[PDB]
Amino acid sequence: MPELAVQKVVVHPLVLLSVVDHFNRIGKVGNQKRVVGVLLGSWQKKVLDVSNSFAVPFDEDDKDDSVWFLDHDYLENMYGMFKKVNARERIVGWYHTGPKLHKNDIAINELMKRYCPNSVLVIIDVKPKDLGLPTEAYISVEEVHDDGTPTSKTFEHVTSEIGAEEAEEVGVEHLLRDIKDTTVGTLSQRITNQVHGLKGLNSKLLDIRSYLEKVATGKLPINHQIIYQLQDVFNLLPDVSLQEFVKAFYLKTNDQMVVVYLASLIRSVVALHNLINNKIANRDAEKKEGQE
Amino acid sequence: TRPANHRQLTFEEIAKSAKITVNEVELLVMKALSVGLVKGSIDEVDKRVHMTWVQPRVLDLQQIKGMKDRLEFWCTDVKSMEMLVEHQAHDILT
Amino acid sequence: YLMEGSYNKVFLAKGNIPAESYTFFIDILLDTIRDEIAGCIEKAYEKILFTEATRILFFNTPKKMTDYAKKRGWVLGPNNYYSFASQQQKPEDTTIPSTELAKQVIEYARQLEMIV
């Protein structure tokens, strides 16, 4: 929002498991379907800490977009059922099992808003495939446009991630002793971050390339806004200050080595002293290996 | 028009298309640097202007088709570099 | 003289006459000598007069020196003018390093992570 009352939406693992369990509750022949629940959580700043969620009977036509049903009475019963068990559990939004956005969503956003303003969507996936997080958070804002078109309820993206508690931490810990990820030490861990990062940039850019190629040919009406922003992108690329930048970057590297040199050197001396310690312990073990 | 590192314009190059001598052009750039249509700097002594950022404005279907291949071109740079540190680095480290 | 370019080596190719068989064969070398000399002079100067170039490459005539000022590609103004090919375009790009130095960094990491 323009309001600094929303920004970091942080979903705890048991929610993720909860929507992925809900997606198989319905999952009979009603699968292949958007399923919706309400997000319970707490928050007090630029966060929306999500903690609990429970499916709400939900149906939706598979060719229409004004034929959606959501048992809000069920909500006004359960919401109290869970309040009676934990205070401090308002309704901070509602989740929608992807795979991506539907025109219908905004409609839902106003039958959930009759409880809590600021409600957010949290698109969670039922299929691991993305390499970034399977948790995108949107808000229902509205704006005015330079083209002069009537105000709209759009959806605006806010950064997202998942966090944890000690409880959560420990349960997850326990569940990933099969797929060990701790054998990997620091240095390599961060090299992984820097290759896996390119694995992101690559596919994001790829998606923009498919879009531009989509309007140029195989027509799809142009939306001037996208192309606008897409110009700022190519002005921001680091280029025009080429020579000077070169002469500086080289220098800062030079420093970087100076300190690496020192590091590796001390490391060597210390390890070698370790070796002297082994040799002397071996001589004095050889005086014992004799004797009687 | 100038797309690249080449983003400097010379006073005597602006004046000819703006139809005014080189004593107005100074102020003229300053109104642009004010409203925001331009961000950058005047290098008055050597008669240069530094055009660092210029507001967007609508394009047509023929300019987009060039941007597509300009962006593609960048994509394969990324691909190849990722492929550079999957070999070697990823191989051993993890 | 050959290995460390010193000239006066064309002059001593007719002064090594104490054994005549030397002066018969050594003539061959004199076509490489001219080449190395012009190889350095292509970088060492930028304006000399024409008759001096005739005195340096050990020619007697102007005609020969026209042909050899045509193979290297120089112009024939009042003084024989050069073209800058010593460091025509500098190595002002560490974008060319870029990939290579990143390989190296990765390599260090391998030695600090391997199981030894």
Side-chain angles (χ1 to χ4, degrees):
Chain A
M1 294 174 75
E3 295 290 334
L4 308 174
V6 48
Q7 192 161 127
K8 282 285 170 184
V9 187
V10 184
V11 187
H12 293 310
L14 89 165
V15 176
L16 304 179
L17 291 200
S18 201
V19 309
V20 161
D21 185 78
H22 171 206
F23 175 74
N24 305 4
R25 296 302 192 167
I26 310 300
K28 304 167 184 169
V29 299
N31 47 43
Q32 317 309 313
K33 296 196 190 314
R34 297 66 53 203
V35 302
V36 168
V38 63
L39 293 181
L40 304 175
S42 307
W43 69 282
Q44 65 293 97
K45 52 178 78 69
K46 313 168 189 297
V47 300
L48 285 176
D49 293 285
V50 183
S51 287
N52 282 74
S53 42
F54 55 94
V56 184
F58 175 93
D59 293 329
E60 184 172 58
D61 199 342
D62 306 89
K63 41 171 166 56
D64 300 331
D65 48 355
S66 248
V67 183
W68 87 108
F69 175 73
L70 186 277
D71 275 320
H72 62 89
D73 296 4
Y74 186 78
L75 279 172
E76 292 170 282
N77 287 275
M78 286 282 296
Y79 176 56
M81 288 295 286
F82 274 96
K83 282 173 66 61
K84 226 192 308 185
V85 162
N86 291 106
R88 194 180 301 105
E89 321 301 351
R90 320 185 56 253
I91 295 174
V92 296
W94 64 281
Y95 70 93
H96 181 287
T97 44
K100 36 58 164 278
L101 291 179
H102 300 273
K103 181 196 181 69
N104 179 265
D105 293 17
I106 180 57
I108 291 167
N109 179 271
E110 305 294 358
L111 300 181
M112 293 289 189
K113 208 175 204 66
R114 286 187 312 158
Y115 303 117
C116 300
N118 317 124
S119 309
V120 296
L121 280 85
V122 173
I123 302 290
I124 303 174
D125 309 319
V126 300
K127 316 202 167 182
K129 42 185 184 68
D130 295 16
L131 312 182
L133 271 175
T135 47
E136 274 79 26
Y138 304 110
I139 317 176
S140 165
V141 287
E142 55 175 77
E143 76 287 82
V144 283
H145 310 73
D146 309 71
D147 315 311
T149 49
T151 281
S152 310
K153 282 93 155 50
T154 47
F155 279 116
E156 208 58 285
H157 169 67
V158 291
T159 63
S160 161
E161 63 201 12
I162 62 177
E165 283 158 333
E166 200 73 18
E168 301 292 88
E169 160 69 6
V170 174
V172 172
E173 178 199 71
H174 183 59
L175 302 160
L176 300 173
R177 294 189 60 82
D178 302 322
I179 298 186
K180 295 191 171 184
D181 40 85
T182 65
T183 293
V184 191
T186 304
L187 160 62
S188 36
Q189 191 54 52
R190 290 168 64 172
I191 279 174
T192 295
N193 290 9
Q194 299 203 170
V195 183
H196 191 97
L198 307 188
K199 277 184 213 77
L201 181 70
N202 183 85
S203 75
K204 282 172 175 173
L205 288 185
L206 184 68
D207 281 327
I208 279 178
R209 203 262 299 192
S210 77
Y211 171 79
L212 289 187
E213 195 221 89
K214 206 169 175 186
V215 313
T217 311
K219 298 309 198 307
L220 206 86
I222 298 175
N223 176 345
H224 71 111
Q225 197 57 60
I226 293 163
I227 314 304
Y228 270 20
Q229 206 156 263
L230 270 164
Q231 265 149 279
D232 275 293
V233 176
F234 291 87
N235 276 12
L236 290 178
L237 274 170
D239 315 307
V240 45
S241 305
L242 198 279
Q243 127 63 26
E244 183 69 312
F245 179 94
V246 164
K247 190 178 178 180
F249 162 75
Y250 240 38
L251 183 58
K252 195 95 295 194
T253 266
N254 176 85
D255 188 271
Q256 197 62 267
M257 307 318 294
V258 173
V259 67
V260 162
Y261 176 59
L262 185 60
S264 61
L265 197 163
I266 297 166
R267 181 195 203 198
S268 189
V269 174
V270 162
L272 190 55
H273 172 226
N274 200 80
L275 176 49
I276 298 191
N277 220 251
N278 276 100
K279 308 314 288 191
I280 182 171
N282 196 79
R283 302 290 297 107
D284 284 66
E286 269 178 282
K287 295 179 190 175
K288 295 297 187 192
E289 283 173 308
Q291 306 289 290
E292 171 184 339
Chain B
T1 319
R2 303 166 177 71
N5 328 284
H6 179 52
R7 292 275 285 210
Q8 295 99 54
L9 283 69
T10 300
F11 295 179
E12 196 55 39
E13 195 166 44
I14 305 159
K16 153 183 67 184
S17 70
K19 311 299 179 178
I20 192 62
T21 190
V22 302
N23 313 298
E24 167 52 46
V25 164
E26 288 186 21
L27 301 183
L28 182 71
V29 187
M30 302 181 76
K31 307 185 189 67
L33 296 183
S34 265
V35 66
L37 301 164
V38 174
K39 305 166 174 180
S41 181
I42 294 167
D43 189 14
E44 197 285 342
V45 153
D46 319 276
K47 317 292 171 161
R48 324 282 306 203
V49 183
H50 284 312
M51 295 305 307
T52 59
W53 183 85
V54 178
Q55 297 192 347
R57 102 229 122 246
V58 181
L59 314 173
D60 56 85
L61 287 162
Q62 183 52 47
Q63 300 175 277
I64 279 180
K65 291 159 189 169
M67 188 176 301
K68 200 285 295 182
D69 299 291
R70 169 66 175 90
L71 186 84
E72 167 54 34
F73 188 66
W74 171 31
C75 174
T76 53
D77 278 310
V78 177
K79 181 56 182 176
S80 83
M81 281 300 304
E82 174 180 305
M83 203 57 64
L84 182 60
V85 288
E86 279 172 352
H87 200 60
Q88 290 181 325
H90 178 71
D91 203 38
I92 280 61
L93 287 320
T94 175
Chain C
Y1 305 143
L2 170 132
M3 173 153 185
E4 180 287 301
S6 186
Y7 307 95
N8 285 13
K9 176 166 75 259
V10 173
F11 178 52
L12 277 159
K14 318 298 170 190
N16 59 4
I17 190 66
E20 292 71 46
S21 299
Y22 297 164
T23 322
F24 308 155
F25 183 95
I26 193 63
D27 312 319
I28 303 153
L29 186 71
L30 297 162
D31 273 272
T32 307
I33 291 168
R34 283 173 177 88
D35 279 317
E36 56 177 323
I37 292 171
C40 305
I41 287 169
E42 256 290 7
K43 311 176 195 299
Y45 313 76
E46 203 67 27
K47 207 229 72 169
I48 64 170
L49 70 164
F50 181 82
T51 192
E52 191 57 29
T54 311
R55 191 66 60 249
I56 286 171
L57 298 171
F58 293 97
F59 292 92
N60 309 308
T61 81
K63 297 181 181 64
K64 274 92 176 60
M65 284 301 303
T66 299
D67 171 29
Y68 304 116
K70 258 64 265 299
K71 295 182 148 296
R72 64 191 181 194
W74 296 5
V75 55
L76 299 173
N79 303 255
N80 204 200
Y81 306 132
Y82 300 46
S83 73
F84 205 75
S86 176
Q87 196 59 66
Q88 164 57 27
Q89 185 65 280
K90 323 302 184 173
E92 76 268 299
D93 282 308
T94 70
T95 54
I96 319 169
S98 69
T99 55
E100 291 308 314
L101 302 178
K103 291 179 183 173
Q104 279 189 15
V105 179
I106 291 304
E107 175 48 34
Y108 309 150
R110 296 179 41 149
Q111 313 183 17
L112 327 163
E113 194 61 55
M114 186 191 190
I115 318 149
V116 182

mmCIF file of all heavy atoms in Angstrom, chain A residues 183 185-188 191 242-243 246 249-250 257 260 267, chain C residues 92-95 97 101 105-106 108-113:
data_model
loop_
_atom_site.group_PDB
_atom_site.id
_atom_site.type_symbol
_atom_site.label_atom_id
_atom_site.label_comp_id
_atom_site.label_asym_id
_atom_site.label_seq_id
_atom_site.Cartn_x
_atom_site.Cartn_y
_atom_site.Cartn_z
ATOM 1 N N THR A 183 25.141 -30.592 5.441
ATOM 2 C CA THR A 183 26.462 -31.025 4.998
ATOM 3 C C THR A 183 27.202 -29.918 4.264
ATOM 4 O O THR A 183 28.436 -29.949 4.181
ATOM 5 C CB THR A 183 26.317 -32.251 4.089
ATOM 6 O OG1 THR A 183 25.831 -33.364 4.852
ATOM 7 C CG2 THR A 183 27.644 -32.630 3.431
ATOM 8 N N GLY A 185 28.725 -26.366 3.796
ATOM 9 C CA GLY A 185 29.230 -25.286 4.620
ATOM 10 C C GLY A 185 28.973 -23.909 4.025
ATOM 11 O O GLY A 185 28.378 -23.750 2.959
ATOM 12 N N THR A 186 29.456 -22.891 4.743
ATOM 13 C CA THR A 186 29.178 -21.492 4.429
ATOM 14 C C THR A 186 29.559 -21.120 3.000
ATOM 15 O O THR A 186 28.692 -20.883 2.146
ATOM 16 C CB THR A 186 29.937 -20.577 5.397
ATOM 17 O OG1 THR A 186 29.598 -20.914 6.746
ATOM 18 C CG2 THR A 186 29.595 -19.116 5.148
ATOM 19 N N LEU A 187 30.869 -21.042 2.756
ATOM 20 C CA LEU A 187 31.398 -20.580 1.479
ATOM 21 C C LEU A 187 30.588 -21.128 0.304
ATOM 22 O O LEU A 187 30.034 -20.376 -0.513
ATOM 23 C CB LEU A 187 32.874 -20.985 1.393
ATOM 24 C CG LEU A 187 33.547 -21.049 0.030
ATOM 25 C CD1 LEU A 187 33.551 -19.694 -0.645
ATOM 26 C CD2 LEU A 187 34.963 -21.569 0.190
ATOM 27 N N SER A 188 30.467 -22.449 0.239
ATOM 28 C CA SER A 188 29.705 -23.050 -0.843
ATOM 29 C C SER A 188 28.240 -22.642 -0.778
ATOM 30 O O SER A 188 27.602 -22.431 -1.814
ATOM 31 C CB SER A 188 29.855 -24.564 -0.794
ATOM 32 O OG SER A 188 29.916 -25.010 0.547
ATOM 33 N N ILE A 191 28.055 -19.401 -2.640
ATOM 34 C CA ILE A 191 28.174 -19.605 -4.080
ATOM 35 C C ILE A 191 26.865 -20.141 -4.641
ATOM 36 O O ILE A 191 26.410 -19.715 -5.712
ATOM 37 C CB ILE A 191 29.351 -20.528 -4.418
ATOM 38 C CG1 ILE A 191 30.640 -19.715 -4.405
ATOM 39 C CG2 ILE A 191 29.161 -21.144 -5.787
ATOM 40 C CD1 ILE A 191 31.873 -20.543 -4.581
ATOM 41 N N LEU A 242 31.848 3.970 -18.563
ATOM 42 C CA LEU A 242 32.539 2.699 -18.775
ATOM 43 C C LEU A 242 34.010 2.758 -18.351
ATOM 44 O O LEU A 242 34.454 1.971 -17.504
ATOM 45 C CB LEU A 242 32.406 2.286 -20.244
ATOM 46 C CG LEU A 242 32.677 0.826 -20.617
ATOM 47 C CD1 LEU A 242 34.166 0.581 -20.738
ATOM 48 C CD2 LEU A 242 32.040 -0.154 -19.630
ATOM 49 N N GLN A 243 34.784 3.676 -18.930
ATOM 50 C CA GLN A 243 36.224 3.703 -18.676
ATOM 51 C C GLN A 243 36.527 3.901 -17.186
ATOM 52 O O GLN A 243 37.267 3.113 -16.571
ATOM 53 C CB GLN A 243 36.874 4.796 -19.533
ATOM 54 C CG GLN A 243 37.748 5.808 -18.796
ATOM 55 C CD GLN A 243 38.963 5.181 -18.149
ATOM 56 O OE1 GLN A 243 39.443 4.138 -18.592
ATOM 57 N NE2 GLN A 243 39.465 5.811 -17.089
ATOM 58 N N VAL A 246 35.801 1.072 -15.000
ATOM 59 C CA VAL A 246 36.823 0.038 -15.139
ATOM 60 C C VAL A 246 37.987 0.336 -14.201
ATOM 61 O O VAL A 246 38.340 -0.476 -13.326
ATOM 62 C CB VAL A 246 37.279 -0.079 -16.604
ATOM 63 C CG1 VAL A 246 38.584 -0.840 -16.701
ATOM 64 C CG2 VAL A 246 36.200 -0.777 -17.417
ATOM 65 N N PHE A 249 36.901 -0.339 -10.400
ATOM 66 C CA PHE A 249 36.623 -1.734 -10.082
ATOM 67 C C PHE A 249 37.907 -2.534 -9.976
ATOM 68 O O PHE A 249 38.083 -3.332 -9.043
ATOM 69 C CB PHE A 249 35.712 -2.340 -11.150
ATOM 70 C CG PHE A 249 35.711 -3.830 -11.165
ATOM 71 C CD1 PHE A 249 35.040 -4.538 -10.195
ATOM 72 C CD2 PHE A 249 36.386 -4.525 -12.146
ATOM 73 C CE1 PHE A 249 35.038 -5.908 -10.206
ATOM 74 C CE2 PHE A 249 36.385 -5.896 -12.161
ATOM 75 C CZ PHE A 249 35.711 -6.587 -11.189
ATOM 76 N N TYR A 250 38.833 -2.319 -10.908
ATOM 77 C CA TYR A 250 40.093 -3.039 -10.806
ATOM 78 C C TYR A 250 40.777 -2.760 -9.475
ATOM 79 O O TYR A 250 41.293 -3.680 -8.825
ATOM 80 C CB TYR A 250 40.999 -2.674 -11.984
ATOM 81 C CG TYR A 250 41.370 -3.858 -12.838
ATOM 82 C CD1 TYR A 250 40.445 -4.857 -13.099
ATOM 83 C CD2 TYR A 250 42.633 -3.973 -13.392
ATOM 84 C CE1 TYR A 250 40.770 -5.937 -13.873
ATOM 85 C CE2 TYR A 250 42.967 -5.055 -14.174
ATOM 86 C CZ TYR A 250 42.027 -6.034 -14.408
ATOM 87 O OH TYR A 250 42.333 -7.120 -15.183
ATOM 88 N N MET A 257 42.221 -8.838 -3.044
ATOM 89 C CA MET A 257 43.264 -9.856 -3.010
ATOM 90 C C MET A 257 44.216 -9.604 -1.850
ATOM 91 O O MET A 257 44.476 -10.512 -1.058
ATOM 92 C CB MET A 257 44.016 -9.931 -4.340
ATOM 93 C CG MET A 257 43.116 -10.117 -5.557
ATOM 94 S SD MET A 257 41.764 -11.299 -5.342
ATOM 95 C CE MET A 257 42.667 -12.831 -5.147
ATOM 96 N N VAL A 260 42.926 -11.264 0.931
ATOM 97 C CA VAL A 260 42.858 -12.725 0.792
ATOM 98 C C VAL A 260 44.235 -13.338 0.992
ATOM 99 O O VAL A 260 44.398 -14.316 1.728
ATOM 100 C CB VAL A 260 42.270 -13.119 -0.571
ATOM 101 C CG1 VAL A 260 42.595 -14.567 -0.892
ATOM 102 C CG2 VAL A 260 40.778 -12.935 -0.558
ATOM 103 N N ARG A 267 46.476 -18.777 7.532
ATOM 104 C CA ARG A 267 45.915 -20.125 7.526
ATOM 105 C C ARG A 267 47.005 -21.167 7.324
ATOM 106 O O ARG A 267 47.085 -22.161 8.059
ATOM 107 C CB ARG A 267 44.865 -20.228 6.430
ATOM 108 C CG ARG A 267 44.192 -21.553 6.320
ATOM 109 C CD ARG A 267 43.496 -21.612 5.010
ATOM 110 N NE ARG A 267 42.405 -22.568 4.996
ATOM 111 C CZ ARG A 267 41.873 -23.042 3.882
ATOM 112 N NH1 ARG A 267 42.348 -22.663 2.715
ATOM 113 N NH2 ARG A 267 40.878 -23.910 3.921
ATOM 114 N N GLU C 92 41.800 -1.127 -22.320
ATOM 115 C CA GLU C 92 41.008 -0.421 -21.319
ATOM 116 C C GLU C 92 39.742 -1.171 -20.931
ATOM 117 O O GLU C 92 38.829 -0.555 -20.371
ATOM 118 C CB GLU C 92 40.642 0.983 -21.825
ATOM 119 C CG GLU C 92 39.516 1.052 -22.881
ATOM 120 C CD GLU C 92 40.008 1.000 -24.320
ATOM 121 O OE1 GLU C 92 40.776 1.898 -24.725
ATOM 122 O OE2 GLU C 92 39.615 0.063 -25.049
ATOM 123 N N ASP C 93 39.653 -2.467 -21.228
ATOM 124 C CA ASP C 93 38.461 -3.262 -20.952
ATOM 125 C C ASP C 93 38.837 -4.421 -20.044
ATOM 126 O O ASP C 93 39.586 -5.314 -20.454
ATOM 127 C CB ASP C 93 37.830 -3.781 -22.243
ATOM 128 C CG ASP C 93 37.025 -2.728 -22.959
ATOM 129 O OD1 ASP C 93 36.153 -2.112 -22.309
ATOM 130 O OD2 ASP C 93 37.251 -2.528 -24.170
ATOM 131 N N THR C 94 38.325 -4.397 -18.813
ATOM 132 C CA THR C 94 38.332 -5.553 -17.930
ATOM 133 C C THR C 94 37.041 -6.352 -18.049
ATOM 134 O O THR C 94 36.820 -7.304 -17.290
ATOM 135 C CB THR C 94 38.534 -5.129 -16.484
ATOM 136 O OG1 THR C 94 37.355 -4.455 -16.033
ATOM 137 C CG2 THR C 94 39.762 -4.207 -16.373
ATOM 138 N N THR C 95 36.163 -5.947 -18.965
ATOM 139 C CA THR C 95 35.070 -6.805 -19.382
ATOM 140 C C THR C 95 35.593 -8.073 -20.052
ATOM 141 O O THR C 95 34.917 -9.107 -20.031
ATOM 142 C CB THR C 95 34.159 -6.023 -20.325
ATOM 143 O OG1 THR C 95 34.949 -5.477 -21.391
ATOM 144 C CG2 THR C 95 33.474 -4.877 -19.581
ATOM 145 N N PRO C 97 38.646 -9.651 -19.165
ATOM 146 C CA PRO C 97 38.838 -10.452 -17.944
ATOM 147 C C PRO C 97 37.548 -11.085 -17.441
ATOM 148 O O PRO C 97 37.393 -12.310 -17.505
ATOM 149 C CB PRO C 97 39.394 -9.424 -16.948
ATOM 150 C CG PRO C 97 40.224 -8.532 -17.786
ATOM 151 C CD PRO C 97 39.571 -8.505 -19.183
ATOM 152 N N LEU C 101 38.601 -14.078 -14.575
ATOM 153 C CA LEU C 101 38.864 -13.863 -13.162
ATOM 154 C C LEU C 101 37.799 -14.528 -12.289
ATOM 155 O O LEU C 101 38.109 -15.008 -11.188
ATOM 156 C CB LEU C 101 38.964 -12.361 -12.884
ATOM 157 C CG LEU C 101 40.044 -11.612 -13.676
ATOM 158 C CD1 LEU C 101 40.017 -10.122 -13.361
ATOM 159 C CD2 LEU C 101 41.435 -12.183 -13.407
ATOM 160 N N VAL C 105 38.429 -17.055 -9.078
ATOM 161 C CA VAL C 105 37.822 -16.962 -7.749
ATOM 162 C C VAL C 105 37.166 -18.295 -7.388
ATOM 163 O O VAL C 105 37.460 -18.905 -6.343
ATOM 164 C CB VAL C 105 36.825 -15.786 -7.700
ATOM 165 C CG1 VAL C 105 36.164 -15.685 -6.346
ATOM 166 C CG2 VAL C 105 37.522 -14.463 -8.011
ATOM 167 N N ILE C 106 36.289 -18.790 -8.272
ATOM 168 C CA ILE C 106 35.671 -20.095 -8.034
ATOM 169 C C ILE C 106 36.726 -21.130 -7.662
ATOM 170 O O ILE C 106 36.542 -21.935 -6.737
ATOM 171 C CB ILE C 106 34.861 -20.529 -9.271
ATOM 172 C CG1 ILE C 106 33.626 -19.632 -9.446
ATOM 173 C CG2 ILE C 106 34.480 -22.000 -9.184
ATOM 174 C CD1 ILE C 106 32.689 -19.558 -8.232
ATOM 175 N N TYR C 108 39.774 -20.844 -6.216
ATOM 176 C CA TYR C 108 40.155 -20.706 -4.813
ATOM 177 C C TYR C 108 39.120 -21.374 -3.928
ATOM 178 O O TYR C 108 39.457 -22.189 -3.060
ATOM 179 C CB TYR C 108 40.292 -19.244 -4.400
ATOM 180 C CG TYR C 108 41.160 -18.423 -5.284
ATOM 181 C CD1 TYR C 108 40.920 -17.073 -5.442
ATOM 182 C CD2 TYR C 108 42.214 -18.988 -5.960
ATOM 183 C CE1 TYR C 108 41.699 -16.308 -6.252
ATOM 184 C CE2 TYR C 108 43.004 -18.234 -6.776
ATOM 185 C CZ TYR C 108 42.736 -16.887 -6.925
ATOM 186 O OH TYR C 108 43.517 -16.101 -7.733
ATOM 187 N N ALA C 109 37.841 -21.051 -4.145
ATOM 188 C CA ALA C 109 36.806 -21.665 -3.318
ATOM 189 C C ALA C 109 36.928 -23.189 -3.316
ATOM 190 O O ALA C 109 36.841 -23.829 -2.256
ATOM 191 C CB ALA C 109 35.417 -21.235 -3.789
ATOM 192 N N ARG C 110 37.160 -23.793 -4.486
ATOM 193 C CA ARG C 110 37.308 -25.244 -4.527
ATOM 194 C C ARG C 110 38.424 -25.721 -3.609
ATOM 195 O O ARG C 110 38.270 -26.736 -2.918
ATOM 196 C CB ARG C 110 37.580 -25.714 -5.945
ATOM 197 C CG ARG C 110 36.445 -25.457 -6.884
ATOM 198 C CD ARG C 110 36.762 -25.913 -8.294
ATOM 199 N NE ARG C 110 37.462 -27.197 -8.312
ATOM 200 C CZ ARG C 110 37.363 -28.095 -9.283
ATOM 201 N NH1 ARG C 110 36.572 -27.878 -10.325
ATOM 202 N NH2 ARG C 110 38.051 -29.224 -9.193
ATOM 203 N N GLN C 111 39.562 -25.017 -3.593
ATOM 204 C CA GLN C 111 40.652 -25.459 -2.719
ATOM 205 C C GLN C 111 40.332 -25.244 -1.245
ATOM 206 O O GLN C 111 40.845 -25.977 -0.397
ATOM 207 C CB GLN C 111 41.955 -24.749 -3.066
ATOM 208 C CG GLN C 111 42.262 -24.722 -4.550
ATOM 209 C CD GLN C 111 43.604 -24.080 -4.866
ATOM 210 O OE1 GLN C 111 44.454 -23.932 -3.987
ATOM 211 N NE2 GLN C 111 43.798 -23.693 -6.132
ATOM 212 N N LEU C 112 39.505 -24.257 -0.911
ATOM 213 C CA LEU C 112 39.124 -24.052 0.483
ATOM 214 C C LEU C 112 37.942 -24.904 0.907
ATOM 215 O O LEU C 112 37.553 -24.849 2.077
ATOM 216 C CB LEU C 112 38.760 -22.597 0.748
ATOM 217 C CG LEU C 112 39.493 -21.523 -0.032
ATOM 218 C CD1 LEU C 112 38.715 -20.232 0.050
ATOM 219 C CD2 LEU C 112 40.893 -21.357 0.482
ATOM 220 N N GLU C 113 37.334 -25.653 -0.003
ATOM 221 C CA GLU C 113 36.184 -26.471 0.343
ATOM 222 C C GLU C 113 36.427 -27.958 0.187
ATOM 223 O O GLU C 113 35.805 -28.746 0.901
ATOM 224 C CB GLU C 113 34.980 -26.082 -0.520
ATOM 225 C CG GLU C 113 33.667 -26.638 -0.025
ATOM 226 C CD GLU C 113 33.318 -26.155 1.362
ATOM 227 O OE1 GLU C 113 33.271 -24.925 1.576
ATOM 228 O OE2 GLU C 113 33.100 -27.015 2.242
#
